[PDB]
């Protein structure tokens, strides 16, 4: 009636993606982690843009939208900030936000690539991803056009807006050979082999294995720059464990109060 003892095995770890394998867990627990990578992992992203002069050919909201999608390195800050709606302040704080500032005027004759080099932060640690490969083009200005704005980055997760989504793509997979026949091929040999298939080039799918559950879920979490790919994971495990602890506290209050 009790818990299971999952085991992890990182196969590849770079600074852009992690490939691990989780064994001995349920498919629901392994898929619910996959969803926590995408939505509920906090990250810093520009979310408040005050435009003082915009004379580019793009809009006013086209700039602000393209600025929200610029990934900012949240890595130890993001767990010290508060959500904006919970800061006991009036008009953003250093303790719930990070302030940015873009001031660009094209004076020369060639066109200006306003890139994210121009976004100057007030904290040295939350910067757009420029640290160590070009930069995210924001606009191109002509001679005489300009852009001054100041912006604010707050904490959030990918369930509100996708801009707060820390991943490029999560590649979940389980049971590479159709051993459980969770999928049923009409012609099983037209199908290419998985990357993880422990199968020879002779046979097409594994023979049917009647009593058997999924384990060995293979993951490949790829970061967008904002968090490091093993911090996305360690944070999704803690974010899930915290949703559950909160549910349990509210449950014990509902039980004792009935």
């Amino acid at each position: 009636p009790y818990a299971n003892q999952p085991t992890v095995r990182i196969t590849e770890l770079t600074d852009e993606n992690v490939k691990f394998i989780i064994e001995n867990t349920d498919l629901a627990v392994a898929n619910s982690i996959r969803r926590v990578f995408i939505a509920e992992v906090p990250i810093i992203a520009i979310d408040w843009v005050q435009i003082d002069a915009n004379s580019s050919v793009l809009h006013d909201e086209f700039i602000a939208h393209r600025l929200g999608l610029i990934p900012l390195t949240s890595d130890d800050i993001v767990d010290k900030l508060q959500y904006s709606r919970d800061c006991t302040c009036e008009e953003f704080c250093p303790e719930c936000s990070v302030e940015f500032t873009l001031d660009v005027r094209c004076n020369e004759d060639q066109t200006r690539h306003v890139t994210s080099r121009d976004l100057i932060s007030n904290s040295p640690r939350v910067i757009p991803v420029t640290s160590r490969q070009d930069d995210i083009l924001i606009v191109k200005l002509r001679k005489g056009q300009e852009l001054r704005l100041r912006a604010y980055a707050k904490k959030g997760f990918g369930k509100e807006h996708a801009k707060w989504n820390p991943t490029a793509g999560v590649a979940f997979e389980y049971d590479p050979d159709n051993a459980l026949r969770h999928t049923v091929y009409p012609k099983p040999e037209e199908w290419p082999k998985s990357e993880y298939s422990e199968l020879d080039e002779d046979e097409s799918q594994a023979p049917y294995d009647p009593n058997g559950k999924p384990e060995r879920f293979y993951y490949n979490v790829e970061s967008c720059g904002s968090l490091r790919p093993e911090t996305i994971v360690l944070s999704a495990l803690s974010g899930l464990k915290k949703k559950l602890s909160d549910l349990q506290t509210q449950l014990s209050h509902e039980i004792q109060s009935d």
Partner: protein, 99 residues
């Protein structure tokens, strides 16, 4: 005391200078207008390339060459078609043959 090619009056002055050259049956006004117009055209084309000196100049060179490599890739694919003329069996295409 303000010059007329500064700044945005450039094209309008170009057409108006052509109109002033065309309105004249005197050759002197026509030649003065032709010289002024060629000088204004060169100055404006120089100003236009200098602003397009960066990052538009870079995409012109890539498009000019992409259609070039398509006219190259087309002819090499055509030679590959002519060479692969050994046997054309497979089904999924048909065609009329009347009378």
């Amino acid at each position: 005391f303000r010059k007329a090619p500064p700044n945005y009056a450039m094209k309008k002055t170009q057409l108006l200078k052509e109109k002033a050259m065309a309105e004249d049956l005197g050759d002197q006004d026509k030649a003065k207008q032709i010289q002024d117009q060629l000088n204004e055209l060169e100055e404006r084309a120089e100003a236009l390339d200098r602003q397009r000196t960066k990052n538009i100049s870079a995409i012109s060179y890539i498009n000019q060459r992409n259609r070039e490599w398509n006219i190259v890739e087309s002819e090499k694919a055509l030679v590959a078609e002519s060479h692969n003329m050994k046997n054309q069996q497979m089904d999924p295409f048909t065609r009329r043959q009347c009378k």
